[PDB]
Amino acid sequence: CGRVRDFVAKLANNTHQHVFDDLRGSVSLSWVGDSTGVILVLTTFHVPLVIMTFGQSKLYRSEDYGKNFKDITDLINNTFIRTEFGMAIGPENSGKVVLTAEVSGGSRGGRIFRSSDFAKNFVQTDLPFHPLTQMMYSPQNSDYLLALSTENGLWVSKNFGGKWEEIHKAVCLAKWGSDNTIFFTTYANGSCKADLGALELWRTSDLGKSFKTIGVKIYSFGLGGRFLFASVMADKDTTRRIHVSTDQGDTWSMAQLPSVGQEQFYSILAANDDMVFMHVDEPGDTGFGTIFTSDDRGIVYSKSLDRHLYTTTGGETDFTNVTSLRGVYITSVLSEDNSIQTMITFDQGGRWTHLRKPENSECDATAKNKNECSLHIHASYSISQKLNVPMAPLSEPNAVGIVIAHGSVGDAISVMVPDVYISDDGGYSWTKMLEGPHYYTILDSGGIIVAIEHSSRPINVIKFSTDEGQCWQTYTFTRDPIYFTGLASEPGARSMNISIWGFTESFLTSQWVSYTIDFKDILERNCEEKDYTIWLAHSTDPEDYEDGCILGYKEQFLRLRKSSVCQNGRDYVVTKQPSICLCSLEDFLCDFGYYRPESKCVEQPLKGHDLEFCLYLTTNGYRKIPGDKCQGGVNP
């Protein structure tokens, strides 16, 4: 360990300073498209008084991954941009930026500045309304925009915000579906807060020319992968139930899920083409609830995890899709003793379990036994309680296996200052990566992991690893230390450019600055076929025939070798071959009406929300797990 020599030379010329405006202003960063290098930076000075009197927005634009910027404030004339709305960037490489300008007193509608050539040219456009929300793009067409007004009217544009037309008047919530469909709720007599529970859900397939009332007595709605969800109030009651439609609200079916009071809430934790994870808050503001995984129809729900930590009103939950490995999800749970623990599922919420203790760790003060304990992960709740946690867990799909996160090693989540931990196998095994809290980033699909220390002092050092966090080279990137604020790499983790943001120590003033580093010379050579190695995902018992079967299949990957030092590339694709396992009874979840004593699904004599689902239809008592792809073997 410590392999590399003369790396300082290879990074010195590739480090790129850029000073911006002083700390009298506030910076806001936004990327525009993949493989572009196009970053926008909006400096904003505001001294807010009784009315608008002083304020200045400047706009900068890079196109070399943030190494150099050109001032483009002239392209928005001399206009103040409202940060609240932000930089509405279009999907894909559409190159469609839209800013929202402040307007004078008594103006009938607001103003926007909009480019569609990666911020090379903007054009001014006065609106017929004052917008309330940021302008949502349609995913199918980047020229199609919806926006909500300050008078609750839903406006739509076909020509990239050039001309707008009010499709409907009394709109609360609205969002795009597939094929340019617009689902939205609307009120009748009183406002959204008052009419909450007696709203009605509308649909338009043709940009508001035609309409269809797809639901009534609505609390709210949501889109989750293939499914359309709607919370619906029980008539002559304050309770509500979740209803589901797979055909854009033409036909509905009530979900096999409990009804909830007004104190409680449902939450779409995660959703794909296969299934949904649904949180249901336990009544009486207890601060937890219950995860339910759906079937492929989104209708029958198995109870996945009890006592799931989710704070009141929503907002805070530690539920984390580990994107670097299939079927893996980490979250936090409350104990009976009121201590928070971290559970991991490897089979999409079939079985949950504690995380394995890392090799290079002692068990902390929370642990009963000094030698035997588990890993616990800091995420959104830890951050909300103001613990010394600079980042939530990080994983990238293209960096297969890699999960980086802060944590504590014991019987529960500890208030003490955490170290950073890494798994290279999607969270089966763990290791202490770095000592004390850091900010972290994955570059080149795992080829380089980068880390900056979280410090009250200013800093001038960046730690990097070419062998997935086992060995760490330390690089001094500036002679003048900075108070670090954040990192910015290109989304997708395919770049080799990291931008270290912060502000200077106090001289005449303090000023915003970004040191951008390219690692292209550190990984001078591209990776050949010899650099990769065969890796079975989910391996427990290598000698076993069913080893690595999760949702009825295995996956053998071509992972990059740790010792190998090379660029994966931008064009890099995750090479994997699946092995289809034989079906067992474990590959089938129990259909409605059936359960497991012990493991075989057997009918039940029906209480609670089961009885309600039965009353308000035909089955052998088994159904295939959604996304389960086993063939042959057991079959009821």
Partner: peptide
């Protein structure tokens, strides 16, 4: 002052 690098498509949890 303030520093923000927001995500374009942040997967906010839908409530019902």
């Amino acid at each position: 002052p303030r520093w923000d690098a927001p995500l374009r498509d942040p997967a906010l949890r839908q409530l019902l």
